[model samples]
Target: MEYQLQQLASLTLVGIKETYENGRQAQQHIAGFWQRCYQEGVIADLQLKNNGDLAGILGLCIPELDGKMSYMIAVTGDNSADIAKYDVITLASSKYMVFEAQGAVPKAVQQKMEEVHHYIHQYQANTVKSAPFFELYQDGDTTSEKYITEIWMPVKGLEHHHHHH
Candidate 1:
């Protein structure tokens, strides 16, 4: 239940992008996306540009699949001639309601997201739906009960709601 309004500096993240149908499909697919990035050395590639002070792993998204949710598994990176090879997204600096989810992967993180999802509509209309929400993960054994993943809900203090997807 503890959360804080935090400011994020503008960030440029580089990595892989995939769209999913949300819920169970997204959970299953993202689990593999995380694994595939590590297995395929995609993580190492981005880590190269991080060069230290690398931001936590980010799973950014545009809500509503079919509503086809567009999700990107990425990390903050600096200049790299090698970086031109991957997908890139730049997020403007903004305030977010940051909440922490503790426990194991997929499940813990997934539960928090559902709460946030309903919250945006029922609890607070303050969230910036136009901006992609972020899932920030640090280095940890996700299987551990103590693992923490940050859930960022954009509480940008915007104009209209014309933008969709």
Candidate 2:
């Protein structure tokens, strides 16, 4: 495996929680408010929710994995049962890079994701989890608003993994 040395950064977030059925609902509710910040030219490193649970929405920072990086969101539940509220989120910190998308509807976002995926595949890196990729809230006064999303992907460092010649 190939690996590269990278630096880690921390972020802070606050949000509400709902069911997976809500899908982009979180964005609908919070995106607009947050967009106000972005419009003001203030970009706050935000973490999006990957799943639903009892406690509500969760916000956390991207963690480092073996000199790599991974973006993780908090899940709802208590640390009591095996299948607690949110069992899927195991908090496995992996190396990840964030890709930003901007444009109309899903077209822009879809294109951005494809680009990132291609880069990851070409480099032989794998995503640590199958949860939602990553996204940001972009809101405006006009009906024509822009949607911005970031793709958080786990990377296998070039030097960290052993390569068999």
Candidate 3:
């Protein structure tokens, strides 16, 4: 099914937490988190495992945000440890245009993400909120040689964007 821009209310479960030493590592972890969790079925959070440690569980129930369907990703861990968490959560519930990524693991997925991000800001689109957008990994990664990921992002003023550039 194709995705259309719409507002969604989501309660996400961060499955695990980790500490990353640098920004590049953090991005990898975020991609890896998507690699591990997205198509695994809805996950129920187990517990709060850390006492404000450098890495820990984060459970956020975000509402009142616009996004595209079939591309929601549930990411775990702390922002300090993973810079990607900071980048991802920075644009939670805004106006998001969805894009699709097919084939390979990290390479194709990362490229498509950047392309969509460029498109949004290319027209001076405002990012209203840094809420949780998502990525949907296709079901063939384990069974086949190719993989797919759909990127979902929130945009700025999409509802009223009809008049703006």
Candidate 4:
């Protein structure tokens, strides 16, 4: 799959945090969280006019460099001051390998992520950075075939290792 190297600006998000044993568990929790956010009008209520196209649901994962991972299901907005109940995370500006995925909820996105990881490992395209990776739900509709999501993984410059036989 073709990937794009893009720069992302700093983002502030408001949401809840949860830890999962694996991606499957994380996906389940994230799916439910988004539904609750929509049903409770959290998404509509938090939409800022100034946010423009940057406003949307975001799923961020921070792998502990171990088997488990921490993730958050959040909406992009300015909620720094009122983070009483909701947790806040600020993603620093960085470069990422952007991968696009489209299909059914969770599965398609999961497969694409695995593909990217394999690509990075096999081709040594870039060195993964110690930062949070994220998924941006374009329309916040994961069930539709038309639904689109972009997975962003922070990476440094290309790395090539020469092996001596």
- Taken over the whole model, the C-alpha lDDT of each candidate is 0.76, 0.41, 0.46, 0.72
Q: What is the lDDT of residue 143 in candidate 2?
A: 31
lDDT of 2 by residue, 105-149 (tens): 445655776677676665553444333334432343223336444
Clashes of each: 2, 14, 13, 0
Q: What TM-score would each prediction reach against the true structure?
A: 0.81, 0.39, 0.50, 0.76
Candidate 1 is scored at a TM of 0.81
TM-score of 4: 0.76
Q: Which parts of model 2 are misplaced by more than 4 Å? A: 1-88, 125-145, 158-165
Model 3 per-residue lDDT tens digits across residues 75-143: 433334434332233323344566667767567767776777666664354543345455644335523
lDDT of 1: 0.76
- Provide the lowest-lDDT 10-residue window in model 4: 156-165
- The full ranking of all candidates by lDDT, starting with the best, is 1, 4, 3, 2
Per-residue alpha-carbon lDDT of candidate 4 for residues 46-105, written as tens digits (9 for 90 to 100): 554226435456778877677678877777667577488677878788878788888876
Superpose all Cα atoms of candidate 3 onto the true structure and report the RMSD in Å to 1 decimal: 10.6
State the lDDT of candidate 1 residue by residue for 1-165, as single tens digits: 567778878877777888877656767788788889889998777766663434578888866535778888878875444456888777777888788899898799889878777656744456876788889888889899999999988875323334322
Best by TM-score: 1
lDDT of 3 at 140: 57
Which portions of model 1 show Cα errors greater than 4 Å? 22-24, 51-54, 63-67, 158-165
